Symmetry: D3
Subunit: 150 residues, 6 copies
């Protein structure tokens, strides 16, 4: 189904480096539809909840500290297979090993400053969307270019 | 002063044509800082207030109808001379007469589908920002790349 | 009216320099619709007819010789004000004096190797289209993106 | 040998989405030479012949219907290993699984709207070129940039 | 004549912002030929000599201080009318008033951080080239693409 | 460590094709820092030393002949994992088999005209840097954007 949605966050390093527009344009060109979008400086509570799966790990603190250190651009994109497709467009965890053409492959060098993060599964996407966005902040009616889907 | 701000709205035609990222990237490359950003479908009340200066004119209705017909990406950019600079980057009212290199010059053809609109003066910017955005939706602390200003 | 058409020819120097795609993309992004397109090596008869307005001038021979020296990409674009708009996107006769952002301003240096030429008026466009293209080579039904025109 | 040729068709969805110039530019930058180019609306006879290998399959009808639904940009490119190289530049059948950097990976989302198709072998290329183009529509003498081949 | 040369320096702010490649590519696409190129951190003596025309003015000190504050990418480009053409591609002194499409118009905001500077006349170019480059650092034989000049 | 360095040379075919700026921009966008840069026409002695590992092979002569046939743009980039990362950004030896998104994948077609070459290991990088550049030609103090490294 064409209504799958994923959550993407341009982290503070991506915003600070002026990469927001470049990133959004890659998803728009692909044909995914923007369904939610806003810039905010995450609070500690929102960050700890977002990274809750890592809470027992040592690196949890650093992830929380970094994401609340500056503005973040949060967005929700809709489309067929968007969850896995957006991860492929992002690259792998280590930017140095990500292929040229991917966001991290083209712009990043360090695991801890890897620019953007997207949901890893439909289930986590559904959880993340509900955490970061109020229902009224998301488009209800979506209309993709008519030349994108059979 | 380097803290001047302007309000820009990517209208429904610009969002529908997948031009949001392209537009944001032009302002980021220029060195202006994103201070507010969100997508919303304007209500009639917000639209009539935004276009209040034209309320006695015949074309008022059409402007209100069009802007509430679909999603809009609202944003606030900060920087020296941003109000006039952003207008220059946009082009003139008629896209056909706008120079190649400007947003309307590169992407538009009709006055009524001219993609984006920006504040025409600091005073109108201040009014528009307060209409479209709550104070907590705007960054308070802004940090431009350190190589941009003397 | 939205059905005006203009004739554009990417000259041999533009084809040889690998600029065909770059040029077509500029008109597509603008919103003009491709209505005719083909590559051919012009015959002397077609060239002399195309440049017939200059036939009494000394430089006529050189224009004819150059345009028949290699492949040319001929195209017809449709849209509101396309004739004048396409000239503005091209630049002025001398590439050195053309503004950055225009095709000649961005890519050319010499009057005699100025990459592309477009019709100078609706009347000349109508004549040029009929010279270079058979009626069955042109789209009859045209459908522009629906977000381009009011 | 440097004179191998392949047939590429930008399908109706690619033309409708304004991707013709972007696609041609990718092959020009690569160093392949444009040897044939035209826009046409395929007739049913030409479509059934093009897709003749699938004629016994159920999905044959849909392929024929779609390709004759609007304009197509047909082209022939020449160069060493162009047949396999052009397929690699295109991506795999499913755009969602195509790598960022490839045409389908960057712009497509659905198998049935996958933008462009290229010959799968030299033999099929030779058949397709002869179907879509008359011999006089193809360049006989080809001259690649002199810095491309040893 | 096609052998005119101009001197361009990407100042410390341009180097620091990662704009070197973008700038060089604009001149290469235009058709000008790179005849000299190097990165160096200017010494005070070289800076005072470069800005010698302003030595009696108050702002002289600041120009000298800034240009010696970090790496500079110095280059010499060759081609017809390159001196005036390169200035047009750069924009005017104030980046805010420079047109979109020009380097300063697209990337700058402050007079004192205006990214790049080029020779203002053939005479000053000849002086600047001799100051910044040793004769053996410059190409003697130049070969422009053959499709650029008549 | 973040101070690893690699040597890259845009070969004569890359310079001749106007690809210098495009290539430098890819490394700048990635976040690597330019630490050395110059254009020169290699002497036979420098070439034979650069390709010394192949001196017993038949193709040695051709490599030496080609690299001394015209200008070369030599550069040194600094950053974490830059040696392997730059090779990945370049592609594989055969441009036809290099993935779209890589420099050779996007721009090349022949093994002998493969545009650019980078060090294959830290040890060879250290040798190549010392061969092509004098110590005073390299930046001593390097400052990467502060948003690149943790």
């Amino acid at each position: 189904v064409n209504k799958e949605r994923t959550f993407l966050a341009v982290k503070p390093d991506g915003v600070a480096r002026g990469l927001v527009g470049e990133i959004i344009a890659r998803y728009e060109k692909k044909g995914f539809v923007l369904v939610g979008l806003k810039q905010l400086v995450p609070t500690k509570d929102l960050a700890e909840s977002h990274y809750a799966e890592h809470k027992e790990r040592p690196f949890f603190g650093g992830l929380v500290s970094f994401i609340t250190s500056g503005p973040v651009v949060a967005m929700v994109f809709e489309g067929k297979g968007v969850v896995a497709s957006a991860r492929l467009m992002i690259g792998v965890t280590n930017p140095l090993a990500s292929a040229p053409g991917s966001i991290r492959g083209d712009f990043g060098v360090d695991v801890g400053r890897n620019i953007i993060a997207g949901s890893d599964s439909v289930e986590s996407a559904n959880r993340e969307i509900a955490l970061w966005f109020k229902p009224e902040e998301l488009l209800t009616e979506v209309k993709p270019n008519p030349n994108l889907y059979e």
